[PDB]
Design a binder for this molecule. Structure first.
Ligand code: 046
Length: 274
């Protein structure tokens, strides 16, 4: 389906210790045309990394939704001794980058449209019995001003720490569930309403709350103790009380009391419609 000889490099997109992503053009007709795609490569095809990459491909082959990144196929390069994953190319990259780079195009109505789409993608993911774990605007991608798609770059498998999106039971017991994805969704909703303004990010805000000078495990200790006793990210400037209430309800230490993604999509769509 994707012959390496016809997969032409266009641009580097992202790199980490685990993998890298590039933009390519798939030109089988060899006439300088063809579809543009995003291609993920494994940096080191060890038995464990390759098993993990194959599990990712299997997950992606099972997902088809408007608000989930679109799998296209695989390419077997280096004479069929290397594996690359082919996805649809999304021009605006991560929603974290888009919010910073394209503030001219964003208002609260757009933020709520993206919020709704994220909930719907998560409703779908739950029907497939997957737990995201990594929900954060860095892992949501933007097709255009009207459409976002949940993904998981998985390139890097305090400012760079994923802990600031994790539910308290995930931090203390490594318990990840649909309900902890709801907690992380509450952090995504906070990220959207802070517009990725300098110093308002979840890592910067939590570090400010615990003490900016803390390093290593002391950060973890303080974050856990803070969350267990009702410490929370503040309401972003200009955020409506009703939107901060959705964040607060997602950030419930009582796991079963968190709303569902179906509840959240309906609530957000009703606020948009009213
Ligand atoms: C400008 C620009 O850079 N444009 C780009 C970049 C770009 O780069 C990407 C972005 C995302 C992804 C790739 C490449 C290759 C794979 N990938 C990706 O999202 N994988 C993925 C892996 C697991 C899971 C779901 N699992 C469930 C189990 N969990 C434990 C983990 C998550 C999902 C999800 F969340 F269901 F969509 C997605 N793609 C399109 N356009």
């Amino acid at each position: 389906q994707f012959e390496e000889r016809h997969l032409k490099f266009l641009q580097q997109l992202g790199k980490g210790n685990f993998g890298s992503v590039e933009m390519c053009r798939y030109d089988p007709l060899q006439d300088n045309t063809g579809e543009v795609v995003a291609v993920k490569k494994l940096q080191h095809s060890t038995e464990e990394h390759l098993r993990d990459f194959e599990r990712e491909i299997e997950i992606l082959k099972s997902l088809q939704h408007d608000n989930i990144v679109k799998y296209k196929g695989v390419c077997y390069s280096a004479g069929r001794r290397n594996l690359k994953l082919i996805m649809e190319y999304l021009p605006y990259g991560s929603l974290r980058d888009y919010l910073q780079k394209h503030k001219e195009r964003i208002d609260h109505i757009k933020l709520l449209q993206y919020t709704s789409q994220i909930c719907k993608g998560m409703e779908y993911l739950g029907t497939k019995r997957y737990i995201h774990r990594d929900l954060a605007t860095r892992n949501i991608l933007v097709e255009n001003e009207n459409r976002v798609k949940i993904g998981d770059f998985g390139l890097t498998k305090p400012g760079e720490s994923p802990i600031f999106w994790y539910a308290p039971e995930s931090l203390t017991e490594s318990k990840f569930s649909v309900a902890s994805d709801v907690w992380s969704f509450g952090v995504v909703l906070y990220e959207l309403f802070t517009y990725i303004e300098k110093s308002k990010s979840p890592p910067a805000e939590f570090m400010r709350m615990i003490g900016n000078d803390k390093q290593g495990q002391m950060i973890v200790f303080h974050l856990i103790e803070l969350l267990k006793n009702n410490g929370r990210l503040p309401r972003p400037d200009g955020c409506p009380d009703e939107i901060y209430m959705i964040m607060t309800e997602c950030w419930n230490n009582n796991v079963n009391q968190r709303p569902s993604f179906r509840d959240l999509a309906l609530r957000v769509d009703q606020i948009r419609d009213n």
